């Protein structure tokens, strides 16, 4: 790897600089280099890794949606044939997106998840595994779409089982996992009722635990609760 010669601490420092500069591709490459040093990641370092790849894949997903919409309109009746270019370029963006997801999934499998023993790290990584399989599922159409969806579901489910046993209902990692699993149910798994039920139960159990929190923790938890409510408002 091109980051193999850089110190772990220097890679982390540069990832933080890249974030300030909105250079998320650089940020992800620095954090990949840091993971490949082989040491476990701290809470702050896990968040840097997630922010970097979330921004990279977010740009790819947005571009893929634009191109997919153009491609489907070209297949409507009355549409003028324009040749292979729209499909080719959508496929180009799609392949790049799949490559980023495969990179993240590879870091999780070699070897972040297997060394993560604490609930906070293990749930974080399993949620990430669910998220990246979910992004693969958004573009999947072939022999493996079903297996990709089940891989996302399985990772989210293992993360949920640990979170329910080991974390309070207001824990922001637990809340963000439930939020994203609910989005998986609604957008990927054709299960809007499961999505609504999960979001409602997560919100209500968090509500009942807010009294235990400091002012700062209260702000962290209620911010994510608002996203659950925003989805429930959209879905009902």
């Amino acid at each position: 790897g091109a980051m193999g010669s850089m110190e772990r601490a220097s890679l982390i420092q540069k990832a933080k600089l890249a974030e300030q500069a909105e250079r998320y591709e650089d940020m992800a490459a620095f954090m990949k280099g840091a993971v490949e040093k082989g040491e476990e990641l701290s809470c702050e370092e896990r968040n840097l890794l997630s922010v970097a790849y979330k921004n990279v894949v977010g740009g790819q997903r947005a571009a893929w949606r634009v191109l997919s919409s153009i491609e489907q309109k070209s297949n409507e009746e009355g549409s003028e044939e324009k040749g292979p270019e729209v499909r080719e370029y959508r496929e180009k963006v799609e392949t790049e997106l799949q490559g980023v997801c495969d990179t993240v999934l590879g870091l999780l499998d070699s070897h972040l998840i297997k060394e993560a023993g604490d609930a906070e790290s293990r749930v974080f990584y399993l949620k990430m595994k669910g998220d990246y399989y979910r992004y693969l599922a958004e573009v999947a159409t072939g022999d493996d779409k079903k297996r990709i969806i089940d891989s996302a579901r399985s990772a989210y489910q293992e993360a949920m089982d640990i979170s329910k046993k080991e974390m309070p209902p207001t824990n922001p990692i637990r809340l963000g996992l439930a939020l994203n699993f609910s989005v998986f149910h609604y957008e990927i798994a054709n299960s809007p009722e499961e999505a609504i039920s999960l979001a409602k139960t997560t919100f209500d159990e968090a509500m009942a635990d807010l009294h235990t929190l400091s002012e700062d923790s209260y702000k962290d938890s209620t911010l994510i609760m608002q996203l659950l409510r925003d989805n429930l408002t959209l879905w009902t």
């Binding site: 998220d131 963000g176 609910s182 989005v183 609604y186 957008e187 996203l227 989805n231 879905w235």
Partner: peptide, 4 residues
């Protein structure tokens, strides 16, 4: 839908 809004994810995290």
């Amino acid at each position: 839908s809004n994810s995290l």
